[PDB]
Amino acid sequence: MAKQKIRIRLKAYDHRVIDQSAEKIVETAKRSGADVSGPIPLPTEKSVYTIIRAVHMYKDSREQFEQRTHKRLIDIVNPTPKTVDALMGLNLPSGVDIEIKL
């Protein structure tokens, strides 16, 4: 669908750090403008790594692992160079992976 817009994606591994950071960049988004979109969730993909507790043998007693990956989705309408600075001004803390986009 056609519209003037900003959109980004975040990624990190902790719902608290990611959602407080979302509170930052939403606050600063509408700080310098309007028409923000909230911190829209995403399915939060996962992984798995099954390993045997072992050195030599005894495969029956296996072990697992995983790496959750939050995903967050934000949009803004009516761009301007100021909310740009709200994007590239504050990501902090920096376990996040921002990819500023249009």
Binding site: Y13, Y49, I52, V55, Q64, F65, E66, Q67
Partner: protein, 60 residues
């Protein structure tokens, strides 16, 4: 031995794959992941350390 096999899998090769992708620090080839290039035990005993991201564990 394992020491010259480090050199084996390090050098140039005649073609694409006579290779094996073994663990950086542990000299074990088997039971290795491409994502990390760490062997079986070593990823685990480091996984406990709270070093690599991340949780780990027990939700599946």
């Amino acid at each position: 031995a394992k020491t010259s096999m480090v050199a084996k899998q390090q050098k140039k090769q005649k073609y694409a794959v006579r290779e094996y992708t073994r663990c950086e620090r542990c000299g074990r080839p088997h039971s290795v992941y491409r994502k990390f290039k760490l062997c079986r035990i070593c990823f685990r005993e480091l996984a406990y350390k709270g070093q690599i991201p991340g949780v780990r564990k027990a939700s599946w």
